[PDB]
Design an enzyme around this catalytic site. Structure first.
Site, short mmCIF file in Angstrom:
data_model
loop_
_atom_site.label_atom_id
_atom_site.label_comp_id
_atom_site.label_asym_id
_atom_site.label_seq_id
_atom_site.Cartn_x
_atom_site.Cartn_y
_atom_site.Cartn_z
CE1 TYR A 209 -5.54 3.58 9.06
CE2 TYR A 209 -6.20 3.30 11.36
CZ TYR A 209 -5.35 2.99 10.30
OH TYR A 209 -4.33 2.08 10.48
CE1 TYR B 175 -1.32 3.69 9.67
CE2 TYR B 175 -0.23 2.76 7.74
CZ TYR B 175 -1.27 2.75 8.65
OH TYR B 175 -2.26 1.81 8.54
N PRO C 250 -4.35 -0.72 18.78
CG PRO C 250 -5.83 -2.46 18.52
CD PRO C 250 -5.56 -1.27 19.39
CE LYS D 93 3.59 2.66 13.52
NZ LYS D 93 3.87 2.19 12.15
CG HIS E 110 -2.07 -0.98 1.11
ND1 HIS E 110 -3.27 -0.82 1.77
CD2 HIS E 110 -2.19 -2.13 0.39
CE1 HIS E 110 -4.08 -1.82 1.47
NE2 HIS E 110 -3.45 -2.63 0.64
C1 LIG Z 1 -7.47 -6.10 16.89
C2 LIG Z 1 -5.93 -6.19 16.78
C3 LIG Z 1 -5.35 -5.62 15.70
C4 LIG Z 1 -3.97 -5.48 15.58
N1 LIG Z 1 -3.59 -4.97 14.42
C5 LIG Z 1 -2.24 -4.87 14.31
C6 LIG Z 1 -1.73 -4.41 13.00
O1 LIG Z 1 -2.37 -4.28 11.94
N2 LIG Z 1 -0.31 -4.21 12.95
C7 LIG Z 1 0.57 -4.41 14.02
O2 LIG Z 1 1.75 -4.10 13.96
N3 LIG Z 1 0.03 -4.87 15.19
C8 LIG Z 1 -1.32 -5.09 15.30
N4 LIG Z 1 -1.81 -5.73 16.44
C9 LIG Z 1 -0.91 -6.23 17.47
C10 LIG Z 1 -0.28 -7.64 17.24
O3 LIG Z 1 -1.33 -8.58 16.93
C11 LIG Z 1 0.44 -8.08 18.52
O4 LIG Z 1 1.34 -7.06 18.93
C12 LIG Z 1 1.19 -9.42 18.35
O5 LIG Z 1 0.28 -10.54 18.38
C13 LIG Z 1 2.29 -9.70 19.36
O6 LIG Z 1 2.91 -10.98 19.15
P1 LIG Z 1 3.63 -11.77 20.28
O7 LIG Z 1 4.27 -12.91 19.64
O8 LIG Z 1 4.45 -10.84 21.02
O9 LIG Z 1 2.45 -12.22 21.19
P2 LIG Z 1 1.15 -13.14 20.98
O10 LIG Z 1 0.67 -13.07 19.61
O11 LIG Z 1 0.18 -12.80 22.04
O12 LIG Z 1 1.67 -14.60 21.23
C14 LIG Z 1 2.20 -14.92 22.51
C15 LIG Z 1 2.17 -16.46 22.58
O13 LIG Z 1 2.63 -16.89 23.87
C16 LIG Z 1 1.85 -17.96 24.33
N5 LIG Z 1 1.87 -18.15 25.79
C17 LIG Z 1 1.24 -17.34 26.68
N6 LIG Z 1 1.44 -17.69 27.94
C18 LIG Z 1 2.24 -18.78 27.88
C19 LIG Z 1 2.81 -19.52 28.89
N7 LIG Z 1 2.53 -19.23 30.17
N8 LIG Z 1 3.63 -20.51 28.51
C20 LIG Z 1 3.84 -20.73 27.24
N9 LIG Z 1 3.34 -20.08 26.19
C21 LIG Z 1 2.53 -19.10 26.59
C22 LIG Z 1 0.48 -17.57 23.86
O14 LIG Z 1 -0.36 -18.71 23.85
C23 LIG Z 1 0.78 -17.02 22.49
O15 LIG Z 1 0.74 -18.04 21.50
C24 LIG Z 1 -3.18 -5.92 16.60
C25 LIG Z 1 -3.73 -6.53 17.73
C26 LIG Z 1 -5.08 -6.67 17.82
C27 LIG Z 1 -5.62 -7.42 19.03
#
Ligand SMILES: Cc1cc2nc3c(=O)[nH]c(=O)nc-3n(C[C@H](O)[C@H](O)[C@H](O)COP(=O)(O)OP(=O)(O)OC[C@H]3O[C@@H](n4cnc5c(N)ncnc54)[C@H](O)[C@@H]3O)c2cc1C
Ligand SMILES: Cc1cc2nc3c(=O)[nH]c(=O)nc-3n(C[C@H](O)[C@H](O)[C@H](O)COP(=O)(O)OP(=O)(O)OC[C@H]3O[C@@H](n4cnc5c(N)ncnc54)[C@H](O)[C@@H]3O)c2cc1C
Lengths: 394, 394
Positions: A201, A385, A293, A297, A72
């Site tokens: 948006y 952005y 969200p 980021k 985009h």
């Molecule tokens: C509505 C929505 C929209 C978003 N849109 C965007 C976007 O467009 N762009 C962007 O940059 N960000 C966006 N985000 C944010 C992005 O989705 C998150 O920042 C991202 O999922 C972070 O990844 P992570 O691996 O750090 O954590 P997570 O995805 O939360 O994964 C963490 C993992 O750890 C596991 N776990 C937890 N506890 C334990 C435990 N005790 N022992 C072992 N394993 C465990 C969990 O099961 C999970 O699988 C959005 C979030 C939401 C909710």
């Protein structure tokens, strides 16, 4: 059981770190509480920064993204009956963003990890962290009733907001900063073509709305809703009627609606912890910080935390420069705070806040009018952005 | 007694409008509640936009300003132990600001008006406005006990925040927007040389401080103080000790102190009314809007209101285009709201607010770090500081 780096969490953060590490010859084991299927059910992110796209290429997991991802060059902001396009590419000096679902990115990494034969223990129950400040930390978990121990040199907490890693750091060594917003986002995924080729948006008197996408035949829409709402009170028809009411008439007019493949409410929150490490434990991604969200980021900040941790770990293993690891937090926080500021700003100018006095509403509208009508204003939105540059290290 | 335009208030607004009008052949009479001496005792403004400087030249009252005014090409912002210079000229595309006291500008206009022999009634007691919607409005006032009537075609309310003009518009036709800040500015004028050749705005944990000037041998300093303070509790020595404590050590080190020529506390406030006219009455300057001093926009907004009113009145008299006057408010408010937004932003990032949570303090600091470290961020401050362009009209 022994490894070099123990990774808690098989979400994007843990898998990306593990992949980068495995490719460089640093053994690592990932422990995940849930099942592969559960992790894959989370819709979440849709927008990726160029920095994240490059990191996926470095990890060698970019085939499907290069094929299916949508690049985009701009995004639209609608307010007070007008649509204004921010030319990201022009204003940021040539950078763009890529729309590729988080479900897909996670799927790609999972397949990549399996093919390489690296260790991943799903359904690792009750993970506990021990001897974090010793020279030999270890993790214990349960697999089918028996308690197993995993010895390692370092532990990367990639377990998200509710993970065990942040809880394992003595509470007195942590400084928490948090803001909870009085609203959430009701999202709906549909197998319908998007209403626009670029994201829209919308700040509307009834509340915020966002028109996003996943591909040419899959859309993702959101509407701001109060925290008191239950997803079961929003039928697909109620959602479409509400979304249409918050968009400019000419956009609502050509919207193709359809049954939801997924519907969920996500509450908005800002959260940061300082520092992001403790002894031989390093936090990455949602384990260390949450951004609303609005700025897209979250996953993107996790990518930079990972890029940073991986490079410091490389130096530690390959170059015997273990002392550089003390710089992890200082490096990550610089980028984290600017992204939090941007996400907070986007959130405050696009959403309708309860009990807002006349002065504030007018200032909100004028913020939009100013930033969207000034070349310098547009550039501040655009460079933030597309994502601010990653820090070099050393 | 009759005239074409009756002007209420002999502060900068009224005098500037009267001068521009007199020069174009449109008779006008100014009514002022106070004495020439009282008006001249008000210190107030020090920073003028280029638009204001040009307006003074057009009114032919710029001799002393061109001689004594100081042209500034930059301003400094100090926070968290560091000083950052904003190159206004470079970043705004060549514009600068001029430091020339409001007392001086008012003195120049008063002398200019006297020389031309235009009418000015000082000590005009109990001014009342009548028949605002008629074709023949009039003003009544008292001079030494006798009630006099002044007939006119139009009335310009340039009587400041506490004037009678805004009070004369039926309250139901006005929409008020207001924000009161929980602090004020304690200012001190001294016959000492300024600590710097450019202004220094300082965000310090103890509160905001500002180092300004009036000439090469006259300084103007301010410190943020709570609303509960009484000026009699701040001896000159207490002020200097406090100011020094809020500045970077190397600046405090070379500060030349001295006895105060004037000391006063000014409370901070944002206020706008919509519309800015009613029938044959037009509000200008502080009569229609107040901006906190942080952005140095108050007198500068009055200048643009005046420039706009004068040009519309010219069209009405010279060209018989009286209907253009209905556009006054719409034209003025566009500029007013952007300046209010800027003044609000400057105020929120530079001052210390009571009961601020950890998240907000960090966001405040990051706002400064971002805007002061990005070329696009610096440009948004600069173009707003030098003053956004005036609107053409028609
Ligand atoms: C509505 C929505 C929209 C978003 N849109 C965007 C976007 O467009 N762009 C962007 O940059 N960000 C966006 N985000 C944010 C992005 O989705 C998150 O920042 C991202 O999922 C972070 O990844 P992570 O691996 O750090 O954590 P997570 O995805 O939360 O994964 C963490 C993992 O750890 C596991 N776990 C937890 N506890 C334990 C435990 N005790 N022992 C072992 N394993 C465990 C969990 O099961 C999970 O699988 C959005 C979030 C939401 C909710
Ligand atoms: C601490 C301080 C610093 C500031 N610094 C700056 C700066 O650097 N740059 C900038 O742009 N702005 C600045 N300002 C703002 C600027 O001083 C004001 O916006 C400006 O004085 C407005 O001029 P005015 O003519 O509209 O009103 P005023 O200066 O208030 O004059 C209005 C006149 O109307 C008269 N009057 C009132 N009531 C009546 C009545 N009933 N009948 C007849 N006459 C009446 C009053 O006596 C007065 O003489 C500052 C203000 C303060 C207080």
């Amino acid at each position: 059981m022994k490894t070099q780096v123990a990774i808690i969490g098989a979400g994007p953060s843990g898998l990306l770190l593990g992949q980068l590490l495995h490719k460089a010859g640093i053994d690592n084991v990932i422990l995940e509480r849930q099942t592969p299927d559960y992790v894959l059910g989370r819709i979440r992110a849709g927008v990726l920064e160029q920095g994240m796209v490059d990191l996926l290429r470095e990890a060698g997991v970019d085939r499907r993204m290069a094929r299916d991802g949508l690049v985009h060059e701009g995004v639209e902001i609608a307010f007070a009956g007008q649509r204004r396009r921010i030319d990201l590419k022009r204003l940021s000096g040539g950078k763009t963003v890529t729309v590729y679902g988080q479900t897909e990115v996670t799927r790609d990494l999972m397949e990549a990890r399996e093919a390489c034969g690296a260790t991943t223990v799903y359904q690792a129950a009750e993970v506990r962290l021990h001897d974090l400040q010793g020279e030999r930390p270890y993790v214990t978990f349960e697999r089918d009733g028996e308690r197993l121990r995993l010895d390692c040199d370092y532990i990367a907490g990639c377990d998200g907001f509710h993970g065990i890693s942040r809880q394992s750091i003595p509470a007195e060594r942590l400084k928490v900063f948090e803001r909870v917003y009085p609203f959430g986002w009701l999202g709906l995924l549909a197998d319908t073509p998007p209403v626009s080729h670029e994201l829209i948006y919308a700040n509307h008197p009834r509340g915020f709305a966002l028109c996003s996408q996943r591909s040419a035949t899959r859309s993702r829409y959101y509407v701001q809703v109060p925290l008191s709402e239950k997803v079961e009170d929003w039928s697909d028809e109620r959602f479409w009627t509400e979304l249409k009411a918050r968009l400019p008439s000419e956009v609502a007019e050509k919207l193709v609606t359809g049954p939801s493949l997924e519907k969920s409410i996500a509450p908005l929150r800002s959260f940061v912890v300082e520092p992001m490490q403790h002894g031989r434990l390093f936090l990455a991604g949602d384990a260390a910080h949450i951004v609303p969200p609005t700025g897209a980021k979250g996953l993107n900040l996790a990518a930079s935390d990972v890029s940073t941790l991986y490079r410091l770990l490389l130096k530690a293993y390959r170059e015997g420069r273990g002392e550089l690891l003390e710089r992890y937090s200082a490096i990550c926080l610089r980028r984290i705070w600017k992204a939090e500021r941007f996400s907070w700003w986007m959130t405050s100018v696009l959403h309708r806040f309860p009990d807002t006095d006349a002065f504030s509403q007018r200032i909100q509208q004028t913020e939009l009018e100013y930033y969207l009508g000034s070349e310098a204003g547009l550039a501040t939105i655009a460079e933030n952005y597309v994502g601010l540059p990653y820090e070099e290290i050393e």
